[PDB]
């Protein structure tokens, strides 16, 4: 038969192949959804009134509906295959994908006097459909949670999905819009019916997997001499101290004052923290000293902030407060866990040609010389683009996020999620599913309300995402062995990146993407 | 309805003070190619624009800020405390998953746009 | 001319995306946090363009 | 003294939102006044009341 | 119990005004209020807050 | 199979389009 | 639309100095020309306010 | 001229850098911006302009 209930409606398929270019990406997970918020769409606000702050108030909906979200790099990529790709590629990029959704189960969940039983119900169904038109609020890219699981083996629970309006305090405004799911052509299922479909990722920039070997100051040749002069002293030398002028041409000793074509990318001061305890200054200064935008009246912070280097070199344990990506070490608990539990990411690799995120862009002169006057220069702590400027993008771990949806905005800047990934104006659409309410009996005489009883029931079944990747292979010339991602030969009682005694599969680590070494 | 005046041409040229440079030019208009009307006579012509970007007139219903959903929990943390809260007084790093509730602490990938300070003023 | 004869157009329908134009931009962090130094934070007033922006242009009427 | 012609022809993007709720818009009062918005007055001198935006259709971010 | 469609088709009929000034038509107050018109409440009831009828657009008589 | 228990028989359709002068209106409910 | 002659026939030379009352900021140097031009580039000239509403509260661009 | 300026060896200290990488390195020959506003011939900025050379022109100071 085409669909009945005794017959697989698709197959696992969690596979990685490497043709040429085109490594393409295979995972298949089991998911399980629950039903949400009563099969009621309910009015979330959080109030200026009570301890909370005004900074984290909010106005929006949550909706009965569950979302599939793949936007994290270990969905697709095995940890041996992650170093396959970082080890020997000067970069890489999303082509094409696709989805399927299967072998969908539903149950039906009894209670009596403390007696809980699950069995089928057949006829029930789902709905699922695809945002592909981009109507609905973007959840994604936001770093939420509830994405595949990085190890195939685990079972998953579905994420709800919700989203947030235009709001003053705990009020909302005229502006502010109401989405209604169920307002939009869905596509219902019943066991042994199967959903699936195919998108094109638009054309985006290979991520740079390549980390530079030679700093933006350093691109010129030792032996030789500019041909060009600058002014070397405005004093003459010794007890005279008579203004001149003098002139020196830049050579390969004096590095530093010889001209270039090409200035460091730009800078938004990052207050600096060490990882040693005694160091910090004993304060809280966490909110307080961190950098923050405001917007609409409304301080938030500048997480994780425009990409610079994490650290100068031998400074290893500072690190920006909020300006690098923090990964939570597996069993960590949400809230105030100690340091030990996180990893915290290092972008240093950057560090040659984008600024520090500790220290100051550089200096400018605040005054004009005189003859009485003395020359002044003023620290730049907060530094623009201006024409010129190269600059890195920020790292994607095998942990990490991979795309997020560029606002349709009038306009706006090299739109590189600041998280790292790929800026895409029409990304891989938002995925919905829900269970299809099914009424408890109704009453005998007609009435007017909405039904409030509902039989109790989730669903469950298998998600497969497939996805072509283009690499971008090195051609480097360097002659000697370069920096690569590897798993130290020395024993230890647990392998990494493998389960437990327990089976808890855990990332012991954040891996980045930049290994191989290119020119600038 | 109503019936208007033409304006007049006129242009400015590089200047120092009531002085000009060298470099300043002098345009004469008759210098020009014109079309000659007299009544009976008409004069036209087409023109089509370049390729633009569509205006906007639609004004956004999601704060920049605000771009993420309330329900889920970040996978990333951030630097929560400096200091041990209460008496002790000694200092320690802490790290949340910024949530729903601590929505301003939550990472994003988009921030806002460009600022030149405005002096503000009251009606 | 009095205030009353002038139409002062408004564009707060881009506050969403767009700094308030009296407010600051936001803070920077002005030096190294110390064992003896505290933190310190600057206005920021004037804001350049930066990898990550996004904005709404001025609107045009009738 | 002569007339002269102005021809525009302009692209529209139409809306395409699923807000399940009324959109603001620009109107014109209802309440009584004692001369008409964007008309002549009693001498015959037309007036733009106020300015009139662009953007009353909302679209997500 | 089961799902049920209704889909219906509608012809319009445009307006043709040459009226100068801006008509009356249906808007939703800019004005803030602690729920949105036309959507669920806290608790998850759609509410229909006034009724809403049919003429706005002005014709001669 | 045509019919069968295992099988959805129907889709969910609530959608509006507008075409020149047709406006076709779409709604389903439980 | 009514020409008036303008400036009697002539290119005159026009500048604004740094001496008497006006500051250095309001110095310039141009021309002004015998010659009128037509400027289009206000929205209101094409589209009547019932159109302006029109457009506005319809399209996204 | 010699003796406007300060009498102070602001060659380095005095001039506009950029920090990378721990080490500052002078701003040269910076971002483009005019020399001087009009007759202040003289000035040039520290490091804002190429130099040349004479013919036969020494390297060191
Ligand atoms: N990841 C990503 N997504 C989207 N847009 C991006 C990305 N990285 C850079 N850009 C921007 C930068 C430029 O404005 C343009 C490509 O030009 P080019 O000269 O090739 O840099 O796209
Ligand atoms: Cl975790
Ligand atoms: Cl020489
Ligand atoms: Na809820
Ligand atoms: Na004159």
Redesign the interface.
């Given at each position: 038969?085409?669909?009945?209930?005794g017959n697989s409606s698709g197959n696992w398929h969690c596979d990685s192949t490497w043709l040429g270019d085109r490594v393409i990406t295979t995972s298949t997970r089991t998911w399980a959804l629950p039903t949400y918020?009563?099969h009621?769409?309910?009015?979330?606000?959080?109030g200026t009134s009570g301890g909370?702050?005004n900074?984290?108030t909010?106005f929006?909906?949550?909706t009965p509906w569950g979302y599939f979200d793949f936007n994290?790099f270990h969905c697709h990529f095995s940890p041996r295959d992650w170093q396959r790709l970082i080890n020997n590629n000067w970069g890489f990029r999303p082509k094409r994908l696709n989805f399927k959704l299967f072998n969908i189960q539903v149950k039906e969940v009894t209670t009596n006097e403390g007696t809980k039983t699950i069995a089928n119900n057949?006829?029930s169904?789902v709905?699922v459909f695809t945002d592909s038109?981009?109507?609905?609020?973007?959840?994604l890219?936001?770093?939420?949670?509830?994405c595949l699981p990085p190890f195939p083996a685990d079972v998953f629970m579905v994420?709800?999905?919700?989203?947030?309006?235009?709001?003053?305090g705990?009020?909302?405004?005229?502006?502010?819009?109401?989405?209604?799911l169920?307002?939009?052509?869905?596509?219902?299922?019943?066991?042994?019916?199967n959903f699936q479909f195919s998108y094109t990722f638009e054309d985006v920039p290979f991520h740079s997997s390549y980390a530079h070997s030679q700093?933006?100051?350093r691109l010129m040749n030792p032996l030789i001499?500019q041909?060009?002069?600058?002014?070397?002293?405005?004093?003459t030398t010794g007890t005279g101290?008579?203004?001149?002028?003098?002139?020196?041409?830049?050579?390969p000793s004096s590095?530093?004052?010889?001209?270039?074509n090409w200035?460091?990318g730009?800078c938004?001061?990052?207050?600096?923290?060490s990882?040693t305890?005694?160091?910090?200054?004993?304060?809280?200064?966490?909110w307080?000293?961190?950098?923050?935008?405001?917007?609409?009246?409304?301080?938030?912070?500048?997480?994780?902030g425009?990409?610079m280097?994490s650290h100068?070199?031998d400074?290893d344990r500072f690190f920006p407060?909020?300006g690098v990506?923090?990964?939570?070490k597996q069993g960590?608990g949400?809230?105030?866990?100690?340091?030990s539990?996180?990893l915290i990411t290092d972008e240093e690799e950057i560090?040659?040609t984008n600024?520090?995120a500790?220290?100051?862009?550089?200096?400018?002169?605040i005054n004009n010389?005189?003859?009485?006057?003395?020359?002044?220069?003023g620290?730049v702590?907060?530094?623009?683009?201006?024409?010129?400027m190269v600059?890195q993008?920020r790292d994607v771990y095998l942990?990490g996020p991979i795309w997020?949806k560029?606002?349709?905005?009038?306009?706006?800047?090299?739109?590189?999620?600041?998280?790292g990934?790929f800026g895409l104006k029409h990304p891989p659409p938002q995925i919905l599913i829900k269970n299809?309410?099914?009424?408890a009996d109704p009453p005998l005489t007609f009435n007017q309300a909405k039904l409030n009883s509902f039989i109790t029931q989730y669903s469950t079944g298998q998600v497969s995402v497939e996805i072509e990747w283009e690499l971008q292979k090195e051609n480097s010339k360097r002659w000697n062995p370069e920096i690569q991602y590897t798993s130290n030969y020395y024993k230890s009682t647990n392998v990494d990146f493998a389960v437990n005694t327990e089976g808890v599969y855990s990332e012991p680590r954040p891996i980045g993407t930049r290994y191989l070494t290119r020119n600038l």
């Open positions: 038969g085409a669909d009945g209930v918020n009563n009621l769409y309910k009015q979330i606000s959080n909370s702050t900074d984290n909010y929006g909906y949550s994290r057949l006829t169904t709905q038109e981009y109507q609905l609020p973007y959840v890219g936001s770093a939420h949670q509830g994420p709800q999905y919700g989203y947030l309006t235009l709001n003053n705990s009020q909302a405004l005229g502006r502010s819009s109401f989405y209604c169920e307002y939009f052509p869905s596509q219902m299922l019943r066991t042994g019916n700093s933006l100051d001499d041909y060009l002069y600058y002014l070397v002293r405005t004093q101290g008579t203004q001149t002028l003098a002139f020196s041409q830049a050579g590095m530093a004052n010889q001209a270039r200035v460091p730009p938004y001061r990052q207050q600096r923290v990882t305890t005694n160091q910090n200054n004993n304060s809280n200064f966490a307080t000293g961190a950098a923050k935008f405001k917007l609409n009246g409304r301080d938030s912070l500048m997480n994780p425009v990409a280097a100068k070199d400074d407060s909020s990506l923090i990964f939570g960590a949400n809230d105030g866990v100690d340091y539990q996180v560090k040659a600024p520090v500790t220290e100051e862009y550089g200096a400018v002169a010389q005189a003859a009485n006057t003395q020359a002044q220069t620290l702590h907060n530094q623009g683009v201006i024409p010129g600059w993008n942990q997020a560029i606002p349709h905005t009038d306009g706006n800047f090299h739109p590189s999620p600041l998280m990934g299809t309410p099914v009424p």
